[PDB]
Amino acid sequence: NFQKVEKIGEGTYGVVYKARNKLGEVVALKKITAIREISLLKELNHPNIVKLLDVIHTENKLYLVFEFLHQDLKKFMDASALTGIPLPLIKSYLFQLLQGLSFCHSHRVLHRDLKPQNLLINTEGAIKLADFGLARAVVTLWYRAPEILLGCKYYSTAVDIWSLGCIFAEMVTRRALFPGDSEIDQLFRIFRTLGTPDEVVWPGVTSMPDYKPSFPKWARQDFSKVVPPLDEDGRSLLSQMLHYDPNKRISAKAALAHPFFQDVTKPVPHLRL
Numbered sequence: 001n002f003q004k005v006e007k008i009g010e011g012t013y014g015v016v017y018k019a020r021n022k023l024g025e026v027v028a029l030k031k032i033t034a035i036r037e038i039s040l041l042k043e044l045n046h047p048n049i050v051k052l053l054d055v056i057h058t059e060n061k062l063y064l065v066f067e068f069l070h071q072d073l074k075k076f077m078d079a080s081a082l083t084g085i086p087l088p089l090i091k092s093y094l095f096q097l098l099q100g101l102s103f104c105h106s107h108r109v110l111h112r113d114l115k116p117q118n119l120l121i122n123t124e125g126a127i128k129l130a131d132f133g134l135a136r137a138v139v140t141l142w143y144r145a146p147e148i149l150l151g152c153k154y155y156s157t158a159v160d161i162w163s164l165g166c167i168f169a170e171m172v173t174r175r176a177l178f179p180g181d182s183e184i185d186q187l188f189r190i191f192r193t194l195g196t197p198d199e200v201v202w203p204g205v206t207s208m209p210d211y212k213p214s215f216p217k218w219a220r221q222d223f224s225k226v227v228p229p230l231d232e233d234g235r236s237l238l239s240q241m242l243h244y245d246p247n248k249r250i251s252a253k254a255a256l257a258h259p260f261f262q263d264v265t266k267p268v269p270h271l272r273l
């Protein structure tokens with residue numbers, strides 16, 4: 001019932017295509033216990049979440065039909081590489097994404113694999129989270145929370161806050177915060193910046209499945225060196241988004257109340273489609 005327009009990309013759960021509903025709507029068409037779980041996400045509707053319009057199960061084949069947006073944040077960041085995304089827009093995008101996370105997390109749904117590629121933007125200054133709740137139904141490790149890397153089986157909504165903190169830092173500096181090319185390189189990049197975690201800062205860390213007493217012990221670096229020129233409000237918020245202990249890590253709801261957002265606005269981006 002769809003005429004494919006073009007290949008828009010490829011995901012962890014199969015290829016995504018721009019398509020026209022043959023019988024005029026323009027959509028994103030993704031070709032992938034699961035059915036019921038995905039059907040749950042059809043009701044999960046929020047302005048900063050990419051709407052899942054339909055789920056089609058035909059011939060052992062599964063199709064997810066989403067609302068179509070025109071650009072992802074990876075493409076936008078690359079396009080804004082010369083002068084950087086203006087700070088007020090970074091703040092607007094962070095604020096909106098925290099609203100979306102706050103909504104999903106309140107419904108006990110986590111993303112688990114946030115990255116610039118599944119953050120979608122439109123001409124009006126909105127940004128939306130794509131692929132929410134799918135995980136629970138080369139792969140980038142850059143935005144992976146330390147508890148996942150250390151083998152925690154039962155991670156929490158805190159994993160998404162970590163990923164978003166990483167993305168926030170990337171928008172500001174125009175460089176990935178922790179660009180690991182393997183699981184241990186990812187972990188050790190985190191440790192080299194934030195200090196190797198211990199029982200003081202993260203109670204229970206030394207008993208985690210993949211923790212090794214042999215991990216090198218690196219000292220923590222000051223945030224003024226890690227994300228210039230983020231102001232003190234932004235640095236404070238980021239540090240709370242990157243706490244090692246998931247229970248100390250700021251929630252989306254609490255983050256929205258942080259002083260960093262006192263002067264938040266909704267600018268219109270310069271989008272070249």
Ligand SMILES: NS(=O)(=O)c1ccc(Nc2nccc(-c3cnc4ccccn34)n2)cc1
Pocket residue numbers: 008009010011016027028050066067068069070071072073075076118120130131
């Ligand atoms: N790369 S880009 O900037 O030109 C560009 C990217 C995405 C879109 N739209 C769009 N819409 C709805 C859903 C998605 C979506 C969800 N999961 C994935 C995984 C891979 C590719 C797209 N998506 N994508 C337009 C353009």
